[PDB]
């Protein structure tokens, strides 16, 4: 049964750094991808990275600096994390499976936002 | 890297009606996109990959066309559920991205 | 179709030997590059993926790089084990092409 | 284990048809593309064409289009590659290979079949 569930912090302040985690079931890490996607209140949908199947890493070239992104196969989590935040980066930050190029199952998002 | 933009931002229609939805690349992403559905505060739900195949479960009054980096998405006779914003996201090479969007609203 | 032009043919090296193999394509491939090893009795392997991905199994004695047209496979310390028929095979656009291949013989 | 089980009929006549079996194990076919891949005689590798069997997406090289059917039954976990009109030309090795790990990039085949050899007659 395929399931990814983020879970996040809820509100951090500005430069404290931050992970969020992705449960995944219903299927192995090595035959898909899990890409971090994030939504600005009042906005599209943003590209941060991916992580294949395989282990390697590909990130916005925007954040590249600021993010990174591994994942623990045994435990089938994986997990994004973020320097030095903005308060810009308040989001609904979400993972998906990638499938055969395609993000065919979404989770349902977690909310960050940057406080003070 | 490689930029989608979506024509229109916005589009007011009527239930019946058949609509039209664009995604134009920087570059060739050899057919290389896909189309999501977020209907208000949900996540997006997958409905065309590889500009034509239809995700399971997805009517077939959805139909995805293109190539180059000309790309579209037609709904044919809207129904009421179908009201929301559109994604299109090409998967050509990394950084993958995301078309602006459209915000499909009823007249 | 893009063309892959894969020198030499063939060759004889001795135990211990450094060789190199190249490859080129009739246009950039932006490295998706992959290598085969084909031993003698037809089992075929995927050594290298992805220009200089190696892949799980397979001896650090065996380099890839490149880069646009250009790309290269180098054995080092050359092993007994080795004598086989390296391919590479362009992954960028369909249809997947393969270079004509190189002989590998120990003297 | 992951393995790909080849077999068919090896020696046939001139303008005949044939039909070869690429059995998975080890994984599900309706989770990967099975590619077909032949081998001429002291030649180099040619890709024939693919099957995405959750799907039925079939992608040809245009030069085998007409000339190779692939076909396959995710009840079987098996997939298929008929070859129609059988020429003298037609006398190679034939593979299936597939993609099992999604690897960074695209286009790596990390398993393969053993071939199967085709004399045309
Ligand atoms: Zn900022
Ligand atoms: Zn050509
Ligand atoms: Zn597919």
């Known amino acids: 049964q395929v399931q990814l569930q983020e879970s996040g912090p809820g509100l951090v302040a500005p430069s404290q750094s931050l992970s969020i985690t992705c449960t995944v079931s219903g299927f192995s890490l090595t035959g898909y991808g899990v890409n971090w996607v994030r939504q600005p209140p009042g906005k599209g949908l943003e590209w941060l990275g991916m992580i294949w199947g395989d282990g390697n890493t590909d990130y916005n070239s925007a954040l590249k600096s600021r993010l990174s992104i591994s994942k623990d196969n045994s435990k089938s989590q994986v997990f994004l994390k973020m320097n030095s935040l903005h308060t810009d980066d308040t989001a609904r930050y979400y993972c998906?499976?990638?499938?055969?190029?395609?993000?065919?199952?979404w989770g349902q998002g977690t909310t960050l936002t940057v406080s003070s | 890297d490689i930029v989608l933009t979506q024509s229109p931002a916005s589009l007011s229609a009527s239930v019946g009606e058949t609509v039209t939805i664009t995604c134009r690349a920087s570059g060739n992403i050899h057919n290389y996109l896909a189309w999501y559905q977020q209907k208000q505060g949900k996540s997006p739900q997958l409905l065309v990959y590889?500009?034509?195949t239809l995700a399971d479960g997805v009517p077939s009054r959805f139909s995805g066309s293109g190539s180059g980096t000309q790309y579209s998405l037609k709904i044919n006779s809207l129904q009421p559920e179908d009201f929301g914003s559109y994604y299109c996201?090409?998967?050509?090479?990394?950084?993958?991205?995301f078309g602006g969007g459209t915000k499909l609203e009823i007249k | 179709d893009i063309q892959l032009t894969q020198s030499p043919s063939s060759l004889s090296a001795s135990l211990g030997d450094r060789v190199t193999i190249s490859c080129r394509a009739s246009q950039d491939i932006s490295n998706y590059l992959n290598w085969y090893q084909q031993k003698p009795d037809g089992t075929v392997k995927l050594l290298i993926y992805y220009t200089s991905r190696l892949h799980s199994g397979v001896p650090s004695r065996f380099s890839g790089s490149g880069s646009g047209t250009d790309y290269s496979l180098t054995i080092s310390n050359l092993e007994q084990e080795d004598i086989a028929t390296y391919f590479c095979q362009q992954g960028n656009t369909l249809p997947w092409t393969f270079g004509g291949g190189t002989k590998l013989e120990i003297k | 284990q992951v393995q790909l089980q080849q077999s068919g009929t090896e020696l046939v006549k001139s303008g005949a048809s044939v039909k070869l079996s690429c059995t998975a194990s080890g994984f599900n076919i309706k989770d990967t593309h099975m590619n077909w891949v032949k081998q001429r005689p002291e030649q180099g590798l040619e890709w024939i064409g693919r099957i995405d069997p959750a799907n039925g997406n079939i992608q040809y090289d245009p030069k085998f289009r007409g000339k190779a059917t692939i076909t396959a039954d995710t009840s079987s976990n098996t997939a298929y590659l008929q070859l129609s009109s059988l020429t003298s030309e037609d006398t190679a090795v034939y593979y299936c290979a597939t993609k099992v790990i999604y690897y960074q990039g695209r286009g790596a085949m990390d398993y393969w079949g053993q071939g199967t050899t085709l004399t045309v007659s």
């Open positions: 590889y500009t034509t």
């Open positions: 998906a499976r990638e499938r055969d190029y395609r993000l065919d199952y």
């Open positions: 996201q090409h998967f050509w090479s990394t950084p993958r991205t």
